[PDB]
Design a protein around this motif. Structure first.
Motif, mmCIF file in Angstrom:
data_model
loop_
_atom_site.group_PDB
_atom_site.id
_atom_site.type_symbol
_atom_site.label_atom_id
_atom_site.label_comp_id
_atom_site.label_asym_id
_atom_site.label_seq_id
_atom_site.Cartn_x
_atom_site.Cartn_y
_atom_site.Cartn_z
ATOM 1 N N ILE A 98 32.525 -16.909 -80.290
ATOM 2 C CA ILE A 98 32.273 -18.110 -79.854
ATOM 3 C C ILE A 98 33.313 -18.587 -78.711
ATOM 4 C CG2 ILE A 98 32.325 -20.385 -80.092
ATOM 5 C CD1 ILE A 98 29.592 -18.784 -80.776
ATOM 6 N N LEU A 101 32.987 -17.887 -74.866
ATOM 7 C CA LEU A 101 32.008 -18.908 -74.161
ATOM 8 C C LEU A 101 32.977 -19.751 -73.437
ATOM 9 C CD1 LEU A 101 29.233 -19.207 -76.675
ATOM 10 C CD2 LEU A 101 29.374 -17.698 -74.716
ATOM 11 N N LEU A 139 22.802 -18.417 -75.063
ATOM 12 C CA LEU A 139 22.885 -17.574 -76.425
ATOM 13 C C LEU A 139 21.736 -16.767 -77.058
ATOM 14 C CD1 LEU A 139 25.495 -19.147 -79.139
ATOM 15 C CD2 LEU A 139 23.338 -17.652 -79.856
ATOM 16 N N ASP A 203 21.187 -10.896 -75.359
ATOM 17 C CA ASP A 203 21.108 -11.981 -76.140
ATOM 18 C C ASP A 203 20.681 -11.842 -77.786
ATOM 19 O OD1 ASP A 203 18.083 -12.244 -76.676
ATOM 20 O OD2 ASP A 203 18.124 -12.157 -74.388
ATOM 21 N N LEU A 348 31.185 -23.226 -82.665
ATOM 22 C CA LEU A 348 30.552 -23.772 -81.323
ATOM 23 C C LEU A 348 30.449 -25.203 -80.888
ATOM 24 C CD1 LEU A 348 29.022 -22.586 -78.523
ATOM 25 C CD2 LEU A 348 27.140 -22.428 -80.086
#
Ligand code: HEM
Ligand SMILES: CCCCCCCCCCCC
Ligand SMILES: [K+]
Ligand code: NA
Length: 391
Positions: A98, A101, A139, A203, A348
């Protein structure tokens, strides 16, 4: 008693349900075996239910559901299927993965803040909602241009988590619409899954198809249910962590200025928001066998509603529970759950909010609340439709 529970569902109380939650908790655990129900509100009782080996998340073990009748995603499954399905996506949501990102999230936040025009704006539409949506679509591999349709179906399925059946003995007025939305979403995701058998994606949906096609660990139907769960969680949760945090800071002396001045306060602001104004207000379990919580027994098959919003304001756990205080010595909550079904999205959601909130405060240090916010009807995934900020 049962009157207090119906007051919770009443839209009139949505802006401030906390007097009701606190009143319920003061009265103690609610054993309502004639309604096949038990309602827990203390931190201890909610903690105990979440950890209890006989607490189930599969609706098939529910008396209320079995009567109403007369795959689900792994959020609503028990072992062994829960263990297997969660195991398949847990690495994808681990902090280390995570963290990658952060650049995308930072660029999105900056873009969204750049597009804000004064003198007043709705935080929901301009930031809190679109940020988590962009991230989850990327995602999963869902085309951002299809968002208009996800949004409506997603909103409906978030609302479907309201405990109408448990509290009222009847389904939501939205039931038919929610079944239609569920069917649309499944069909839609099925088509995206099928194209990933022909064109390589980068993905999570593609990664799940690779596993499904290699062996017996996963079915197509399970990929659909899993991706549906993840998509909806991405649309209907973090938005409220961001907006509830913004609202609490605007309402609490010095807090907006303090974050504007020092972005390192973000983590404390976020955890104190999880405690004080939780995006997920309550969760349900079903007694898989006769079981005991504290001194109260719950008959096999009964629904146990856990009022996490009340539990977070338990004075036996936290001092000044009804104060929003990011500087408090101990921030304890169950806002991401606990144990087997602990929120997979927590790293996240935390990252999204950690980037968004201090950037928002720093951009508009003189921000003030404009009027009073408007709330959605939702009880479980409770949130604002409008949060107006004067810059
Ligand atoms: C602030 C935002 C969020 C909050 C407050 C929240 C809250 C929760 C809670 C309370 C649970 C436990 C439900 C239960 O025990 O029955 C849960 C589970 C879950 N969450 Fe979140 N969540 C958030 C964001 C997200 C995001 C962004 C995702 C991923 C897109 C996500 C994915 C999941 C999944 C897959 C589960 C089921 C875990 C399992 O059943 O093993 N969550 N969440
Ligand atoms: C299919 C609906 C999934 C949306 C739930 C997101 C995660 C929050 C958990 C809420 C449990 C009541
Ligand atoms: K398979
Ligand atoms: Na796992």
């Amino acid at each position: 008693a049962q009157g207090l529970l119906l007051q919770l569902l009443d839209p009139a109380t949505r802006a401030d349900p906390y007097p009701i939650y606190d009143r319920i908790r003061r009265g103690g655990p609610l054993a309502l075996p004639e309604a096949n129900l038990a309602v827990f509100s203390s931190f201890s009782d909610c903690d105990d239910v979440l950890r209890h080996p006989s607490s189930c998340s599969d609706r098939t073990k529910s008396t209320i559901f079995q009567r109403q009748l007369a795959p689900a995603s792994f959020l609503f499954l028990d072992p062994p299927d829960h263990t297997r399905l969660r195991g398949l996506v847990s690495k994808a949501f681990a902090p280390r993965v995570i963290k990658r990102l952060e650049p995308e999230i930072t660029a999105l936040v900056d873009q969204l803040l750049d597009a804000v025009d004064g003198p007043e704006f709705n935080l929901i539409d301009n930031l809190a909602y679109p940020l988590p949506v962009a991230v989850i679509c990327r995602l999963l591999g869902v085309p951002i241009e299809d968002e208009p349709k996800f949004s409506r179906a997603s909103a409906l399925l978030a609302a479907a988590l309201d405990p109408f059946l448990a509290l009222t003995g009847e389904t939501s007025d939205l039931f038919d619409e929610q079944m239609k939305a569920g069917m649309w979403l499944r069909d839609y995701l099925r088509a995206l899954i099928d194209e990933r058998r022909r064109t390589p994606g980068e993905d999570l949906m593609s990664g799940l198809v690779a596993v499904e096609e290699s062996g017996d660990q996963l079915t197509e139907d399970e990929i659909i249910a899993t991706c549906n769960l993840l998509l909806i969680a991405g649309h209907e949760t973090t938005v409220n962590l961001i907006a509830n945090a913004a609202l609490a800071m605007l309402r609490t002396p010095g807090q907006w200025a303090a974050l504007a001045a020092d972005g390192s306060r973000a983590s404390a602001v976020i955890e104190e928001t999880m405690r004080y104004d939780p995006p997920v207000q309550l969760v349900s379990r079903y007694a898989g066998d006769d079981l005991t919580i504290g001194t109260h027994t719950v008959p096999k098959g009964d629904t146990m509603l856990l009022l996490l919003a009340a539990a977070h304001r338990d004075p036996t756990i936290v001092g000044a529970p009804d104060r929003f205080d990011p500087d408090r010595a101990q921030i304890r909550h169950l806002g991401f759950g606990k144990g087997a079904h602990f929120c997979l999205g927590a790293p996240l959601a935390r990252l999204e909010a950690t980037v968004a909130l201090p950037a928002l405060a720093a951009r508009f240090p003189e921000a003030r609340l404009s009027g009073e916010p408007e709330y959605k009807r939702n009880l479980t995934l409770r949130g604002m439709s409008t949060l107006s900020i004067a810059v």
